[PDB]
Amino acid sequence: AQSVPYGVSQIKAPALHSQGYTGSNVKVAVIDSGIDSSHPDLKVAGGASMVPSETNPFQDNNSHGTHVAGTVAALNNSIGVLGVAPSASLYAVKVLGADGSGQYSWIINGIEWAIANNMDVINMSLGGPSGSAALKAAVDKAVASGVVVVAAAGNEGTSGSSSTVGYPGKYPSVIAVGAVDSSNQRASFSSVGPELDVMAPGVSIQSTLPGNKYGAYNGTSMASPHVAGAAALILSKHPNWTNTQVRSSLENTTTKLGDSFYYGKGLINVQAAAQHHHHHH
């Protein structure tokens, strides 16, 4: 039997599934450590590797990209878990090696690949404390080109009154996602700052792991793909909505939680986001 991880329920993804919308024909790039395409609960449609020494994007030697991919799009069947957008066309854009790290140019090359291959959504469950002009230009270019770009806010926790959101989440063109638990409490590690846009479940998130396994991971890395998957659900119900519109629909329909410094606009609610008229619940 399949299990629906609590976070998929918490963002109201099943309301879209019951309307008949599951992210079909929406192309989502998981820009990450690869995706294990052999997993029976994932279907990977394509991809490319930008990691010079690891040329196969369908081999995930870290585990992180596979876990992130399962939250976006684990298949709807009688096994494993269920993704937010279980019919999405999933692309493994490998820019991180086995050790979880990548050079700025590898990430940029992955973003450029995504643009050239007409991805509708990019998820980047990754970050660093500093930006670069070239990184900002790559994300800005993707957004100008119509791509919804979603990233983890970072796991820096608080630092008095300072922002701790990392890059690329910290760029205005990118939706920066913080982490809450099943009670909607911010995770203590979740980055904070005026750049924090929305929150999604990021504590004890069950998803796919390489070699036909499943496991619970924690992080803003886990929160980001709930939002990337929600963007794919929205686009499957409203295929002409622009990235501008998908982003606004998610921002304008959150359940507000605490102060925006700690919670941004609150928890996403993809049911409300995918209605024509938007308000917070």
Added chain:
Amino acid sequence: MKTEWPELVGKSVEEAKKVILQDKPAAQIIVLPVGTIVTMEYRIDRVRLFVDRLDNIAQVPRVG
């Protein structure tokens, strides 16, 4: 519980590893170049060390 080591910035990677393992003996330490992009999962057992090209610590080590 010590979870950050600001006193280690500018020290050698060797001294940082030694100090962190005294405070957190079960730590899984990974050394990476500063200015790279990394996964955003949170692992309470991990301490990443970000080094400059001289192998000195360039960022405050923390658990995660």
